[PDB]
Design a protein around this ligand. Structure first.
Ligand SMILES: [Ca+2]
Length: 223
């Protein structure tokens, strides 16, 4: 997260870190045994880390649970990042309380202008590299389809939306991928891509979760 703020320990209780010896992506807990992330985060050998604030220090609310299966969306195209979404099942159920909690799926697609909370452990610099160790947060509005397509001609599908600031300075970034965009208490986006970070007229691009609620529910119901 570039230009954000320190969330505070366990204030984003659905935020997970995907660990394969190191944090490599975020995700969102959507029930006690399922996490949703970005398909471009896929790898074997994932351990899901819940209850994290400082990902380099054991602070006392962590749950470390290995993945039993990962399901990349059947239509994921890694070249275009269309359908950049995947589901990760936990080997055992997470224990849920105030510091570890699932985030509700949307009942509808949120509108341009809605303010959302974007969070992750990714790079905090647009020129250079500094990773924060504790969870960072950003409040940002969903942008119109027309501003999104004008920023990224030929690249925005119906499964994507932009959020952030056309002036730059505030954005998600490398290492935030797979993590949440939450608006009015519902998971509306997954951190997916962007040209650099916090650049002018290059806002963040996010997987549009509302398109995938039926796939997520039916996948969970049969796996
Ligand atoms: Ca920790």
């Amino acid at each position: 997260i570039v230009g954000g703020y320190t969330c505070g320990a366990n204030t984003v209780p659905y935020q997970v870190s995907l660990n394969s010896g190191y944090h490599f992506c975020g995700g969102s807990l959507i029930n006690s045994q399922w996490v949703v992330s970005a398909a471009h985060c896929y790898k074997s050998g994932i351990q899901v880390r819940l209850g994290e604030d400082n990902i380099n220090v054991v602070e006392g609310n962590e749950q470390f649970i290995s993945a039993s299966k990962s399901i990349v969306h059947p239509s994921y195209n890694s070249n275009t990042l269309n359908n950049d979404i995947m589901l990760i099942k936990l080997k055992s159920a997470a224990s849920l309380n105030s510091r570890v909690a699932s985030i509700s799926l949307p009942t509808s697609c949120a509108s341009a202008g809605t303010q959302c909370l974007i969070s992750g452990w990714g790079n905090t610099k647009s020129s250079g590299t500094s990773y924060p160790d504790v969870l960072k947060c950003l409040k940002a509005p969903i942008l119109s389809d027309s501003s999104c397509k004008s920023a990224y001609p030929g690249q925005i599908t119906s499964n994507m939306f932009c959020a952030g600031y056309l002036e730059g300075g505030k954005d998600s970034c490398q290492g935030d991928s797979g993590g949440p965009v939450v608006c009015s208490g519902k998971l509306q986006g997954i951190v997916s891509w962007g040209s650099g970070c916090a650049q002018k007229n290059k806002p963040g691009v996010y997987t549009k979760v509302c398109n995938y609620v039926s796939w997520i529910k039916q996948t969970i119901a049969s796996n």
